[PDB]
């Protein structure tokens, strides 16, 4: 957190911060979140490699 960080770098808080509430009725709702917000979607961490002998 207290580091100097390189030039194109994600800040330590926003490396993991969750966005504001997607519902317009709740406070701290951003314009981006109200424009594109989907609570019922947890992104799968898709990753796969390998296949040498084949």
């Amino acid at each position: 957190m207290m580091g100097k960080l390189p030039l194109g770098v994600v800040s330590p808080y926003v490396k993991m911060s969750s966005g504001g509430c997607s519902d317009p009725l709740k406070f701290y709702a951003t314009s981006y979140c109200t424009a594109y917000g989907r609570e019922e979607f947890k992104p799968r961490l898709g990753s796969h490699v390998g296949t040498g002998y084949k």
Partner: protein
């Protein structure tokens, strides 16, 4: 990232900024102890602009409390958010100025400058990429108007490129609370005119006016006045901390407001100052917001822009709105009142939005305007200083400190240079 060190000088500076650190603690969800108890995740995303991290999950404001007297610092510590400041930032001496600009600037503050520079440079180094500093003081005192400028003049030499804001408090004509007021005021504004990027002119008699007019408070104490000033200071850097559809910073507001380097004096205002009779009969909608924005009664200076020409106008909005109405209503004020805006600058208004409104409120805005009506302040100080400087009145106090008499001549000649140069820009042909 983008950090600000909040300076502080004098009783006015300490009492104003004591409220200021509270209102931004509430905005960031920080308890009087100093820990994070907020609920939204954006409440701690850009907290490093002001706060400094401490061990145990605590936060220390990046403030430097300076005053020649240890007096108000006891009251500062005895406040509700008293112990949020780390004690090593409190810098103070033995004997104050006693509303004497000379003692603060030359004979007493010159001992206190070196220590403050040590704390300031310590805070300056800690942040990676500091945007600038920010000083709150009054021009009718001895320390904030005195050594408070000597901090300005030294630091500018050390850091030229960084922005320096000054939420100064200028004396008022109708009722004054210091008799050597124009002596310190006419000689402090010379320091501002050479070493300052922006100054906001806040006058108390306007602040006393607004509380009765737009809020109808029977007993507005200096706390309600100080909260009114501190809402402006939050409103200029809200776009710095919180994301917006169309963002702005201090420097973005800096470039568009000074057409020439001599002009950095403005008059601010706060939009949703709504009275306790008028909330029942009201419709919170953006034309009503800009209606109260541009009404001259809402200014917090002792000058009437209806007497002069608006050079450039800033409108920093808070809350989620629709920008078509933001662009239209700005255009309506632009054209319906043609003669109050200069002709050689088309589109004299700059707009910016910040998505998150102030806590507990839905819609808001703040206004920064550079007007030629501010020259009515300088001439008034000039005459009140000259009439006091004709007869060598109250002067033995200052020249006994070792100052010659000649700085008063150049401080008033520079000051009367500004009013003549301001006047020529008012009466200019397209």
């Amino acid at each position: 990232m983008r950090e600000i060190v909040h300076l502080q000088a004098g009783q006015c500076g300490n009492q104003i900024g004591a409220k200021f650190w509270e209102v931004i603690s509430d905005e960031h969800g920080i308890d009087p102890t100093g820990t994070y108890h907020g609920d939204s995740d954006l409440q701690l995303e850009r907290i490093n602009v002001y706060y400094n991290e401490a061990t145990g999950g605590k936060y220390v404001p990046r403030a430097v409390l300076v005053d020649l007297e240890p007096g108000t610092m006891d009251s500062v510590r005895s406040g509700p958010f008293g112990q949020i400041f780390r004690p090593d930032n409190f810098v103070f001496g033995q004997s104050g100025a006693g509303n004497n600009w000379a003692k603060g600037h030359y004979t007493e503050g010159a001992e206190l400058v070196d220590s403050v520079l040590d704390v300031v440079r310590k805070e300056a180094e800690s942040c990676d990429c500091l945007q600038g500093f920010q000083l709150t003081h009054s021009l009718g005192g001895g320390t904030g108007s005195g050594m408070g400028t000597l901090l300005i003049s030294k630091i500018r030499e050390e850091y030229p490129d960084r922005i320096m804001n000054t939420f100064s408090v200028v004396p008022s004509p109708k009722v004054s609370d210091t008799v050597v007021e124009p002596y310190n005021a006419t000689l402090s504004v010379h320091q501002l005119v050479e070493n300052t990027d922006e100054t906001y002119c806040i006058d108390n008699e306007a602040l006393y006016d607004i509380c009765f007019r737009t809020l109808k408070l029977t007993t507005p104490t200096y706390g309600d006045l100080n909260h009114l000033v501190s809402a402006t200071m939050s409103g200029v850097t809200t776009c710095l901390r919180f994301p917006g559809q169309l963002n702005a910073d201090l420097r973005k507001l800096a470039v568009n407001m000074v057409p020439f380097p001599r002009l950095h004096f403005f008059m601010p205002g706060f939009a949703p100052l709504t009275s306790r009779g008028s909330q029942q009969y009201r419709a919170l909608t953006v034309p009503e917001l800009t209606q109260q924005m541009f009404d001259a009664k809402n200014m917090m200076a002792a000058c009437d822009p209806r007497h002069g020409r608006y050079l450039t106008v800033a409108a920093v909005f808070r809350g989620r709105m629709s920008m078509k109405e933001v662009d239209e209503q700005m255009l309506n004020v632009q054209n319906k009142n043609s003669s109050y805006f200069v002709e050689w600058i088309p589109n004299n208004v700059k707009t910016a939005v910040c998505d998150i409104p102030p806590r507990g409120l839905k819609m808001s805005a703040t206004f920064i305007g550079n007007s030629t009506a501010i020259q009515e302040l300088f001439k008034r100080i000039s005459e009140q200083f000259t009439a006091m400087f004709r007869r060598k009145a109250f002067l033995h106090w200052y020249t006994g400190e070792g100052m010659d008499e000649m700085e008063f001549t150049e401080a008033e000649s520079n000051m009367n240079d500004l009013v003549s140069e301001y006047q020529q820009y008012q009466d200019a042909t397209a």
